Amino acid sequence: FARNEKEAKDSAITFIQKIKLDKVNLGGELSGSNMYVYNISTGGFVIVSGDKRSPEILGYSTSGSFDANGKENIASFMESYVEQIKENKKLDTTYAQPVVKSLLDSKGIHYNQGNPYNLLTPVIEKVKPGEQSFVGQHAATGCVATATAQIMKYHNYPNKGLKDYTYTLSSNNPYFNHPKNLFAAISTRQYNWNNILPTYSGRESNVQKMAISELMADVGISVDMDYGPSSGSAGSSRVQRALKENFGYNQSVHQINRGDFSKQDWEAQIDKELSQNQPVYYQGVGKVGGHAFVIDGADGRNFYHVNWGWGGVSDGFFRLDALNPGFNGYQSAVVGIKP
Amino acid sequence: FARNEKEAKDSAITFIQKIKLDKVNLGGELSGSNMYVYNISTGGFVIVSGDKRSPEILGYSTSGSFDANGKENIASFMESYVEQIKENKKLDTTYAQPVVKSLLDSKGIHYNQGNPYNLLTPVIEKVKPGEQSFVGQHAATGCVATATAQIMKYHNYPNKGLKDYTYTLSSNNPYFNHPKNLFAAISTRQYNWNNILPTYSGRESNVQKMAISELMADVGISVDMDYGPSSGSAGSSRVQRALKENFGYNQSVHQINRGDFSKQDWEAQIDKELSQNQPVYYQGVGKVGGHAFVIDGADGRNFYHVNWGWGGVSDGFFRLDALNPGFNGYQSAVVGIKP
Amino acid sequence: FARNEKEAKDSAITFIQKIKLDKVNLGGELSGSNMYVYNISTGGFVIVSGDKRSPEILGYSTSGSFDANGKENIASFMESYVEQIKENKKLDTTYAQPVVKSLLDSKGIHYNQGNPYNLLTPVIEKVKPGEQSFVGQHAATGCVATATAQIMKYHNYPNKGLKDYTYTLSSNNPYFNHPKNLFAAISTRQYNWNNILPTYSGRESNVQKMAISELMADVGISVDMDYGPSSGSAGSSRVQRALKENFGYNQSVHQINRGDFSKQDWEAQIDKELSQNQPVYYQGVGKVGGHAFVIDGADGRNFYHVNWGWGGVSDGFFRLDALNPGFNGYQSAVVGIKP
Amino acid sequence: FARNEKEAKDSAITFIQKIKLDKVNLGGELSGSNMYVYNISTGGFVIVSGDKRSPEILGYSTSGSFDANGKENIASFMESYVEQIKENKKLDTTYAQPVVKSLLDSKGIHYNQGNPYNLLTPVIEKVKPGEQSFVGQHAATGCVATATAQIMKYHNYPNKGLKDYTYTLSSNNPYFNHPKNLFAAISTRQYNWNNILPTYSGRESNVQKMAISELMADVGISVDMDYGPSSGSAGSSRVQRALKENFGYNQSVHQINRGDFSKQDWEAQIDKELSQNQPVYYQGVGKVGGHAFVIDGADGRNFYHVNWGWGGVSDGFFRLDALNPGFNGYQSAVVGIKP
């Protein structure tokens, strides 16, 4: 029932062909061989299950490459796939939708969490014990901030911020002196979506960077972002409330939880959203917060297209889970996102 | 004698096959159809001549992609290829080396000119009339600084800076108040090449960024970098002198000028260098300075591998010229670069 | 009850004798004759009260000379003496400790706020309306940075900086573009107290100047120095917190406020400190920040020895106040300053 | 015939009285006890001969203090006094004018050779072997530049520079790359003597420092200043030619050499100059150049008042020589300096 190196490698090429493959090295929880990843050298990647009870191809991309190093939201996903491929080993049987092209890619939207996006997030003031100093560096925008902003740029809305926001930074935060209150005067904003480019290379002037870093700063606060070398938020629940109350989005904007649905009904919800050119905020829940990203397409063959808010690396088609017909990662999402 | 779209496009695929191709849009000097560029969508690119008198395949890459937007050193080259393909139109006949794998890629070295590399370059103080403001942004590292630094990291040398440097910023520089004197205390440096990573994603700590941003700051000064939203230097002549006197490299480090050699003898020089695992500083001379880059490999079929000091975009194999057996772009290079 | 010119002058000589005296010219707040200052020509000075209800001799120095021009911390004190000599005019009666030799002088410590100390403070970028341009000049180190640094050199500690610091320049600051974030990598410092001389004449090499200018740059930041042609800080409160957390001094380092003590108990605190060869950070509070200085001795006859962080001019013995047995200038101090 | 410590010390106090004295420590050539220096602690100093054949009091000042450390022109003088007091030991007998108050002091002129005076001298580019680096520092104005500038400010002339100047830096100069040509467009100057203050404290704006730093730069070039951590010039011969041809002074400005005169006639020359409120450029010749200064007064008792172009330290009354009625140090001077 196990699928080993040579075999997986083969499963890859086969999938592609249906060439040189360099295996990717992930560690920590993604250590072991319950799963395999091979970056195709001319471009692209294929992620293979390491056990025939689980499905064969878990995710792929004709182009680009796959990587999780430092990109936690991405690793948090692969972890579930894994502590899931294991839940399939409980069985003894082997493994047994329309098409939407990446909505964000179609508008060339590829944001990140660093400079210049983070040009206006709080500047880290203290060193976390047992960690190198990031003092003087701007916090990261956070992923939910990134996942949210990308979806916002895709609708280029609002033009005018609706309601101001404020919150107190978690007192157990080691990077800042306490108390720390952050405030975004969203209500007084005139978001110029001509200045907020779909992507930055880092050579933009002050007008363009100021635009985006500011969008990112407001979203981040609206979701009570716990800022640091990396930044986390509850996610879904702040995101849905923020989009409507602060940024003026439609009442349809709401949260749905993976656990309230049947796999087909859950998928039907996402497919429905994509059918309307409405990207979907999605996240996996963990301690440190929502490990969010954006689903903005689908290959029709049950794979969804993800944008990890890292500029494009690791972007591609993935399976909502490796489950055999069930750990869901306390998954959830914010749908109905539209003006 | 002309090669038109459909034809070029064909030439491309044929080259590749020997798939989908999206044509790339360049403007200014690269406008017209004396040359064509197609980015292969699964990955890679091919640059085609638009006139049979010039050679067919001018440059290519199995992966990655091609782009010149904003990357002046890269456009400065394509420009010569062009105002060269034209010089072959003077004839009436049609167009008529070992292998080294990218030396820099082999050590995973891919530097840029922005953040965090430019974390310590001068902060732009003034606005150039008729240009948007970059005030408060850090100047760009400049390319020759970048092309130089990649070569330096490849050798991970020196460990100790050898001799201090200083220079006065050109007085006609609009981004700074004058006078402006820049100083690098190179003689007091203990370059830790463990902290100066081969590439940065921007999530590095303070130790790693500090390291690189500082290397880049001393090199940029050692070559009298005229700093701004973009940064230029004389190039070759400062580079060769800087490597030896300031950073302690071998007396063999010296400059050579394209115009002093015969095409085969000029190539022989570069081939020789690569044979020794010694990347080659290379540039094209123009008003604004040396449009430099790094040549660190060869396909054996008369193509050289270039690293544009932009993180990897446009990287690949190129021809030293499109000349038919002659504008050389006042080309030159610094060779013999070793400890 | 008034003491006039001739009388004061006499009071001076008498004090000295117990010779030629050139009266000093102060203006603004120190205008009038509530107080007189005479520089002894062969050396020294004596500051006399202009009204018999207040004490006769307010301050003196066997050598050197007195002057307040441009030296605000010094004028801010003389101002209190005055708007204090007046408060004594409310009465109708006439006016009614071991010895420590200048601690700092004993170690030849005489810092200033200018070049080369300020060699690494922020370079002023803008012109304050209605003021001449200091653009391109380095900001002043600020006094509290100076007062602090002298005390630090007196203890030649730390050897290793403890914790990094960062702050955002006040937004109403006219000499700089905003936002402006300053960072000192204190945590990575290896203070060489052999290079940080006790005083500079300005002919020092790069090693010595670099040393000091850098010490001064880290201290000035640790106290959120609002930089300009002149530089101010909250003082006491940043100074006590900085010494301990950033530079690793003893937990005993703490702030005390003049208003929490009785004149005798307040003096007892300072006397105690000096008894331990522990100079005292002292300041007077005003709008623009703490008008700080250092008290490092006492004549035993109720006079304290001050070092104004101006190289030595105006240094000498002074009275904590001219009060008759009460405006205290919101005075305060940081004591217990030791490794 | 020898005068020892206790005795010299006594001679001092006697001279003064006619108190505490701290002996001054000079080394190198001024080592030994052929001469003694005691700084009076309340202020002032007295320099005593250490051998009764030479005269007793060589120099004094009621105020200030004496020091030679680093101040070569001052040490170069004391050296002659010494290798002169020795020339008197050839004998066996024991030792056997109107008044002008410091001309420069009367106008509060006290220049230095450093910042901000040197704000515009060449920036040192290279390190002299076996010496610490001063790279990036501005050269020193040089003493003859300083002695000359003080005399110029005393007459506040010219208003308009007369003739441009240019020269090539000595090729054996280790602090600069060669060739090095320096140029002052003196002919186009409009010296604003309201901006050229008689002295700077270092807190002046840009207008004041720019003024002086520029006066100092032009004078230094006019005399072919060999620039470095310290700066030397032929002196006298360039100074006399410069003042007339470049700055437009009177034809009376000319050089005179100590060796062309009899001691009384030489003095008569200086006394005459002082009688006309015309300070005198003076110097002692050595290898490295003219060890210059300014004579601008006399005590009538055969002592001349010197200003060492160091801000005031060591200033006072000195004897043209310690000779007993003869090494003259190849002395010389430029007199007749007037508009």
Q: Which ranges constitute the DSSP H helices of chain B?
A: 5-17, 72-85, 143-155, 206-222, 236-245, 263-275
Q: Of D118, D125, D135, D177, which to mutate for an interface test with B (greatest number of B Cβ within 10 Å)? A: D135
Beta strands in chain A (DSSP E): 21-23, 35-40, 45-49, 57-61, 165-168, 181-184, 254-257, 280-286, 289-298, 304-307, 316-318, 332-335
Contact assignment for D135 to B168 by CB distance below 8 Å:
no
The Cα-based distances of A76 to A299, A328, B150, C280 in angstroms read 23, 12, 34, 55
User: The tokens of A50 are what?
Assistant: 């390491």
The Cα-based distances of A105 to A153, C87, C213 in angstroms read 12, 76, 51
SS3 for B155-199 is HCCCCECCCCEEEECCCCCCCCCCCCEEEECHHHCECCCCCCCCC
CB C159 within 8 A of CB C152: no
Give, to the nearest 10 degrees, the angle between helix D236-245 and helix D143-155: 40
Stated as kind and residue range, the H or E segment containing C255 is: strand C254-257
Q: DSSP assignment of A146-195, as one string?
A: HHHHHHHHHHT--SB--S-EEEE--TT-TTS-SS-EEEE-GGG-B--TTT
Would you mind telling me the total number of residues written for chain B in this entry?
A: 339
CATH level 3 topology of C1-104+250-339: Cathepsin B; Chain A (3.90.70)
Distance CA A254, CA A335 (A): 6
CB D309 within 8 A of CB D324: no
DSSP-based three-state secondary structure for B57: strand
CB-based contact, C206 to chain B, within 8 Å: yes
Q: Omega before B179 cis (within 30°)?
A: yes
CB-based contact, B17 to chain A, within 8 Å: no
Q: Omega before A179 cis (within 30°)?
A: yes
Would you mind telling me the total number of residues written for chain D in this entry?
A: 339
The Cα-based distances of D184 to D112, D156, D215, D229, D236 in angstroms read 21, 19, 10, 21, 20
B254 is in an annotated binding site: no
Residues with Cβ within 8 Å of B287's Cβ and at least 6 positions away in sequence, in order, are none
Q: Which residues pair with A22 in a beta bridge?
A: A39
DSSP-based three-state secondary structure for D236: helix
Residues with Cβ within 8 Å of C42's Cβ and at least 6 positions away in sequence, in order, are C19, C20, D42, D43, D44, D62, D63
SS3 for D67-90 is CCCCCHHHHHHHHHHHHHHCHHHH
Residue C268: Cβ within 10 Å count? 13
The Cα-based distances of D164 to A217, D123, D219 in angstroms read 58, 21, 11
Q: Which ranges constitute the DSSP H helices of B195-285?
A: 206-222, 236-245, 263-275
Gaps in chain D after residue (C–N beyond 2.5 Å): 18, 96, 325
Distance CA C193, CA C159 (A): 8
Residue A321: Cβ within 10 Å count? 23
CB-based contact, D174 to chain B, within 8 Å: no
Contact assignment for B165 to D127 by CB distance below 8 Å:
no
Distance CA D239, CA D218 (A): 12
| Cβ neighbours of A127 in C, within 8 Å | 163-164, 187
Question: Pairing state of beta strands D21-23 and D35-40?
Answer: antiparallel
Q: Of A135, A175, A214, which to mutate for an interface test with C (greatest number of C Cβ within 10 Å)? A: A135
CATH number of B105-249: 3.30.910.30
User: The tokens of A143 are what?
Assistant: 């992923």
| Cβ neighbours of B112 in A, within 8 Å | 202
Residue B139: Cβ within 10 Å count? 25
Q: DSSP assignment of C309-322, as one string?
A: SSTTTT-EEE-S--
Half-sphere exposure of B261 (CA within 13 A, CB side): 15
User: What residue has token string 């370079």?
Assistant: C123
Distance CA A235, CA A306 (A): 17
Half-sphere exposure of B327 (CA within 13 A, CB side): 17
| Cβ neighbours of A137 in B, within 8 Å | 206, 209
Contact assignment for C185 to B210 by CB distance below 8 Å:
yes
CA-based nearest distance B287→chain D, Å: 25
CB-based contact, D194 to chain C, within 8 Å: no
Side chain identity at A263, as an amino acid letter?
K
Residue C158 is classified by DSSP as -
**Nearest residue in D to C19, CA atom:** D62
The data reach a resolution, in angstroms, of 3.0
User: What residue has token string 């000079």?
Assistant: D26
Q: What angle do CA B27, B29, B35 make, to 5 degrees?
A: 80
Distance CA D313, CA D41 (A): 14
Query: Residue D298, class by beta-carbon neighbours within 10 Å (0-12 exposed, 13-18 middle, 19+ buried)?
Result: buried
Half-sphere exposure of B282 (CA within 13 A, CB side): 29
Q: What angle do CA C10, C15, C21 make, to 5 degrees?
A: 50
CA-based nearest distance C218→chain A, Å: 14
Closest partner CB to B177 (pick from C136, C177, C210): C136
Contact assignment for A125 to C163 by CB distance below 8 Å:
no
Side chain identity at D241, as an amino acid letter?
R
Given CA atoms C9, C11, C12, C18 in this order, what sign does their dihedral have? positive
| Cβ neighbours of B41 in A, within 8 Å | 62-63
Q: DSSP assignment of D117-171, as one string?
A: GGGGSPBP-SPPTTS---TTSBPP--HHHHHHHHHHHHHT--SB----EEEE--T
Q: What is the CA radius of gyration of chain D?
A: 20
Given CA atoms B215, B218, B220, B223 in this order, what sign does their dihedral have? negative
Q: Of D63, D71, D200, which to mutate for an interface test with C (greatest number of C Cβ within 10 Å)? A: D63
CB-based contact, C185 to chain B, within 8 Å: yes
CB C226 within 8 A of CB C234: no
CB-based contact, D229 to chain C, within 8 Å: yes
Catalytic status, residue D291: yes
| Cβ neighbours of A74 in B, within 8 Å | none
CA-based nearest distance C124→chain D, Å: 11
Residues with Cβ within 8 Å of D282's Cβ and at least 6 positions away in sequence, in order, are D147, D292, D293, D294, D295, D306, D331, D332, D333
CB-based contact, A17 to chain B, within 8 Å: no
Closest C-alpha to B149, from B101, B197, B201, B207: B197
Q: Of B124, B206, B213, B214, which to mutate for an interface test with C (greatest number of C Cβ within 10 Å)? A: B206
CB-based contact, D70 to chain C, within 8 Å: yes
Distance CA C219, CA C148 (A): 7
User: What residue has token string 């692209």?
Assistant: A44
Distance CA C313, CA D312 (A): 14
Given CA atoms B3, B6, B12, B17 in this order, what sign does their dihedral have? negative
CB C42 within 8 A of CB C19: yes
Would you mind telling me the total number of residues written for chain A in this entry?
A: 339
Q: Of C203, C213, C230, C313, which to mutate for an interface test with D (greatest number of D Cβ within 10 Å)? A: C203
The Cα-based distances of C42 to C45, C257, D16, D47 in angstroms read 10, 39, 11, 17
CB-based contact, C136 to chain B, within 8 Å: yes
Distance CA C237, CA C285 (A): 11
CB-based contact, A127 to chain C, within 8 Å: yes
Closest partner CB to D62 (pick from C42, C112, C115): C42
User: The tokens of D145 are what?
Assistant: 């530049």
Q: What is the CA radius of gyration of chain B?
A: 20
Half-sphere exposure of C13 (CA within 13 A, CB side): 12
Question: Pairing state of beta strands D304-307 and D293-298?
Answer: antiparallel
The Cα-based distances of B325 to A35, B53, B89, B152 in angstroms read 55, 10, 12, 35
**Please, which chains are in contact with C (at least 3 CB pairs closer than 8 A)?**
A, B, D
CB-based contact, A129 to chain C, within 8 Å: no
Contact assignment for B133 to A206 by CB distance below 8 Å:
yes
**Please, which chains are in contact with D (at least 3 CB pairs closer than 8 A)?**
B, C
**Nearest residue in B to C188, CA atom:** B207
CB-based contact, C19 to chain B, within 8 Å: no
User: The tokens of B82 are what?
Assistant: 């062009």
Would you please indicate which residues of A are annotated as catalytic (active-site) residues?
Answer: 143, 291
Closest C-alpha to C280, from C299, C296, C258, C261: C296
User: What residue has token string 């006078």?
Assistant: B179
Closest C-alpha to C272, from C112, C122, C98, C88: C98
Chains A and D touch (3+ CB pairs under 8 A): no
Distance CA B184, CA B187 (A): 8
Q: Where are the domains of chain D?
A: 1-104+250-339, 105-249
CB-based contact, D210 to chain B, within 8 Å: no
Determination method here? X-ray
CB B241 within 8 A of CB B190: no
CA-based nearest distance C139→chain D, Å: 10
Stated as kind and residue range, the H or E segment containing C145 is: helix C143-155
Distance CA B9, CA B20 (A): 10
Contact assignment for B201 to A41 by CB distance below 8 Å:
no
Q: Which residues pair with A168 in a beta bridge?
A: A181
Q: What is the CA radius of gyration of chain C?
A: 20
Q: DSSP assignment of D281-321, as one string?
A: EEE-EETTEE--EEEEEE-SSS-EEEE-SSTTTT-EEE-S-
CB B49 within 8 A of CB B4: no
Q: Which residues pair with C232 in a beta bridge?
A: C226
Would you please indicate which residues of C are annotated as catalytic (active-site) residues?
Answer: 143, 291
CA-based nearest distance C186→chain A, Å: 11
Q: Which residues pair with B335 in a beta bridge?
A: B254
Contact assignment for D127 to B166 by CB distance below 8 Å:
no
Contact assignment for C177 to B206 by CB distance below 8 Å:
no
Residue in B110, B143, B254, B305 annotated catalytic: B143
Closest partner CB to D127 (pick from B163, B168, B183): B163
CB-based contact, A125 to chain C, within 8 Å: yes
